[PDB]
Symmetry: C4
Subunit: 82 residues, 4 copies
């Protein structure tokens, strides 16, 4: 799949994750964006995490939709810098 | 391996993880499902984790049986939406 | 690489990780084994982690020697159950 | 890509991550090196993490530039030990 398409896909995941965390868990846009990257990259510091059932469900959806997309995006980015 | 078979395998892992954590560590079904995803996806927030020796042994079994299965499931899911 | 050789390699990693965390960080053998799996699988709950400079150095060595070995072991294990 | 080149690339990531965390978040050089490995390997214990907006932005940059580089480095290292 074209690298630029994979870029748009991961940007869409990032918007989804960030807006979701912001509105569901109430954290700031900046913290939510950070939490989104930390989650889809599978880092998972745990400094931020969902504390509501809706947030937990949402996080599972983000995990399923976002980890693979992020992994593909990283590997494509590798091809370009490297 | 057929995508639908991989689906059944990851659903089986999810049931195993969720019921195990619920019964061993005593967390609610919802928290246990969430913890299962967070674990097999290798996110590992650490907001929930086992606090008993049996829970620790169980978590190691889940890690070994579940991380690979979830990884294959994600990559198969990639192909379908993408 | 033969699957059984990969098994021995990951067992060697597990022994190294467990003994090291036990002796350097002072946690029980059981906690240390659990921490080793949680680390080399890249889950990283953070319920346990090194609190000394030697422990931090050691953990970096385990990360480098163990994450790859564990990942290959998992994928070979997938071939056998699946 | 030649293994030695991948080695230089991951060393550059490690320097970037370590110096960045040290200067932005104020942790010691040793803690910062440890945090860098824990982050780019995707372990993410969360015993250390950024607490400023600049640190969060920086961490996202390190995650994008470093996780892929580390993954390739680990797999090349595997080829040599194994
Ligand atoms: K983690
Ligand atoms: K991970
Ligand atoms: K993790
Ligand atoms: K954590």
């Amino acid at each position: 799949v074209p690298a630029t398409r994979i870029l748009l896909l991961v940007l869409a995941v990032i918007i989804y994750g960030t807006a979701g965390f912001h509105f569901i868990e109430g954290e700031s846009w900046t913290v939510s964006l950070y939490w989104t990257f930390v989650t889809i990259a599978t880092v998972g510091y745990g400094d931020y995490s969902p504390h509501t059932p809706l947030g937990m469900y949402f996080t599972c959806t983000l995990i399923v939709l976002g980890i693979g997309t992020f992994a593909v995006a990283v590997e494509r980015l590798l091809e370009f810098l490297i």
